[PDB]
């Protein structure tokens, strides 16, 4: 957020620009200039309403169509399961990059269900997704309050929310929340499996000696349920995102990782790509990954 000073700057001005706010409503100018069409229909059925509620979020992601969600709530409620959440995160999708998008989300943030809870959880991480603090009022950070529970769908999309929350909002807490949940190691309950991946989404591109050690303290330990290649991988690629920063890592990391072979394994082969932000346009795409196909 810088300052007004002509070196740091980031005025009170860029706030609407550099972190985007108004330009999109502005783009929504030309976006209406040259446009697409409205496919949404209340359809007949919750099986049909499942996706259709997502679509208002699909079509209107970053856009406010929310009236069809705002004014038709049960369209997102008839969606149930993690499509409940989907139809809620579609609202956050609608409300992505908002000053405050908690509105419908906090409503769905809890109704009856972790899945319902999961809705805003993901959707609120979506509110400020693409930034950290949202566009004005606090919404993404407050979400860290709602994350807290070692239970299935709550953690699930809160893990989702807080992964995308804490990209750029990065926090040890969610780890220190999920790390023991990770030590608790239950995908259908603790949900910590995918959490590590959301945890991979937190400190990205940075050395966290904790997570360096933490999953070294979990994965090596094979915390709780792990037999499956699941808690292998979920933790594997968890480390692959957060660091991947170094001159010798871009090629040294994979050297020690995708060389052997495990869950954490064949995937990370290209995760060294989405790794260091210094030296893009790398060829090892085909260069290296011809081999494992051969």
């Amino acid at each position: 957020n810088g300052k007004l000073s002509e070196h740091f700057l980031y005025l009170a001005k860029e706030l609407n620009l550099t972190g985007p706010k108004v330009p999109e409503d502005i783009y929504k100018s030309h976006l209406d200039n040259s446009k697409s069409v409205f496919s949404s229909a209340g359809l007949d059925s919750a099986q049909q309403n499942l996706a259709s509620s997502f679509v208002n979020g699909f079509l209107n992601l970053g856009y406010c169509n929310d009236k069809l969600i705002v004014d038709n709530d049960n369209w997102v409620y008839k969606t149930k399961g993690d499509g409940m959440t989907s139809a809620v995160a579609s609202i956050g999708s609608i409300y992505q990059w908002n000053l405050d998008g908690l509105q419908q989300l906090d409503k769905y943030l809890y109704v009856d269900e972790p899945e319902v809870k999961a809705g805003a959880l993901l959707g609120i991480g979506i509110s400020a997704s693409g930034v950290h603090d949202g566009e004005v009022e606090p919404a993404l950070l407050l979400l860290q309050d709602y994350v807290t529970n070692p239970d299935t769908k709550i953690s699930s999309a809160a893990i989702l929310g807080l992964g995308i929350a804490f990209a750029g909002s990065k926090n040890d807490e969610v780890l220190g929340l999920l790390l023991p949940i990770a030590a608790s190691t239950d995908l259908p309950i603790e949900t910590a499996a995918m959490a590590s991946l959301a945890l991979a989404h937190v400190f990205v591109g940075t050395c966290n000696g904790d997570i360096t050690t933490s999953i070294m303290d979990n994965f090596l330990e094979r915390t709780a349920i792990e037999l499956k290649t699941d808690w292998v991988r979920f933790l594997a690629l968890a480390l692959g995102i957060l660091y991947m920063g170094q001159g010798e890592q871009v090629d040294d990391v994979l050297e020690t990782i995708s060389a052997i072979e495990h869950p954490m394994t064949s995937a990370i082969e290209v995760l060294v790509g989405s790794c260091a932000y210094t030296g893009t346009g790398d060829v090892l795409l085909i260069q290296d990954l011809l081999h494992r196909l051969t």
């Binding site: 200039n33 090629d251 030296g279 090892l284 290296d288 081999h291 051969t294």
Partner: protein, 381 residues
């Protein structure tokens, strides 16, 4: 230099990784059996030919079994016919792996078709064309009959039989060639998923004799193979139409190539299933034998309706372009006389550059007016 070389430095080591890498699982897997199995498997198959030293096939050499050799050579070495009496071999006459009659038939079957054809079909057929509704814009009146000529009989043959009839067994298309014309054929071809034979008369007359005759047969052959197929001729004018150029005397075969086409298409060919369709500039050129019923029944222009058809056609076309929704295609269509469901793109398609010259997303009225002017003036033809 230096800093760039750092990128260049990263380039070398990165490549060395795969080089180092590739060697790794290389050690692991150690490729004979993909083939050496199949090889030795089909080496039996190979040997299954190789006994007795042995879908066009052209020539089966299934060779030198004397007791017996059970093969045809159509070839200047040892021409052969298995028949003269009841002469077969239980699955397969004999060998080459080739077993069968070559192409040229001797008795029947015998070993199921070894056949058929040399030069593939030098003519080539796209089935289920890329056009279903593609140029079908504005083309209705034609297709309206085409569907009758083609679509419905392909759809519900029974009705015509229920009536006691067939579809029009052959049909003419004329006006600007292939313009949507062939594609429009291709349209209902892919509308009905019938086999659409695009054969141009250009293909028909070549360096040699019986040329299209050979083809037209193979055509008419694989017509019945491809049955429920559209034989389609653009350039009936290629072979020409009715003419006395046999009075000159060189054209005769070219003339016959038609008469070929004429003769064979007449008697035995099912045209309720095998569709025959003709495209020309000049219907005036027809050899009347073509225009004969039971050969050509329906006769149709491509065509060029009114202000109205064009609008839709325009409206149809411009949907590709970013187009000003205020201005009316009716407005534009008023101005232009009647012209082709190809040319009507010059209306739209040219305006894109207008739209780019005017740097519009959406071309203005004048953008098309000019185009109307520009193009039509630019004709002077």
């Amino acid at each position: 230099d230096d800093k760039i070389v750092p990128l260049t430095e990263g380039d070398i080591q990165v490549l060395k990784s795969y080089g180092a890498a590739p060697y790794a699982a290389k050690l692991k897997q150690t490729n004979d059996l993909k083939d050496i199995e199949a090889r030795i498997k089909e080496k039996a198959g190979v040997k299954e030919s190789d006994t007795g030293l042995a879908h066009p096939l052209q020539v089966a050499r299934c060779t030198k079994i004397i007791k017996a050799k059970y093969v045809i050579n159509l070839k200047q070495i040892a021409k052969f016919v298995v028949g003269l009496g009841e002469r077969v071999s239980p699955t397969d006459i004999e060998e080459g792996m080739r077993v069968g009659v070559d192409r040229s038939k001797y008795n029947i079957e015998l070993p199921l078709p070894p056949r058929i054809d040399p030069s593939v079909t030098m003519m080539t057929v796209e089935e289920k064309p890329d056009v279903t509704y593609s140029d079908v814009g504005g083309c209705k009146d034609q297709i309206e009959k085409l569907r009758e000529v083609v679509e419905l009989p392909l759809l519900s043959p029974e009705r015509f039989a229920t009536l006691g009839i067939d579809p029009p067994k052959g049909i003419l298309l004329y006006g600007p060639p292939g313009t949507g014309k062939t594609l429009c054929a291709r349209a209902v071809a892919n509308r009905t998923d019938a086999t659409f034979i695009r054969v141009i008369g250009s293909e028909l007359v070549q360096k040699y004799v019986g040329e299209g005759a050979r083809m037209v047969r193979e055509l008419f052959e694989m017509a019945r193979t491809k049955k429920a197929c559209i034989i389609f001729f653009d350039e009936i004018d290629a072979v020409g139409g009715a003419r006395f150029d046999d009075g000159a005397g060189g054209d005769n075969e070219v003339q016959r190539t038609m008469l070929e086409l004429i003769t064979q298409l007449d008697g035995f060919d099912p045209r309720g299933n095998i569709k025959v369709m003709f495209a020309t500039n000049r219907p005036n050129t027809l050899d009347p034998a073509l225009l004969r019923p039971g050969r050509i029944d329906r006769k149709v222009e491509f065509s060029l309706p009114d202000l109205e058809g064009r609008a839709n056609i325009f409206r149809i076309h411009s949907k590709s372009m970013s187009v000003e929704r205020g201005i009316r295609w009716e407005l534009i269509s008023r101005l232009c006389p009647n012209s082709t469901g190809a040319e009507l793109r010059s209306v739209c398609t040219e305006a894109g550059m207008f739209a780019i010259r005017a740097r519009r997303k959406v071309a203005t009225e004048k953008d098309f007016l000019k185009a109307v002017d520009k193009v039509i003036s630019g004709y002077k033809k």
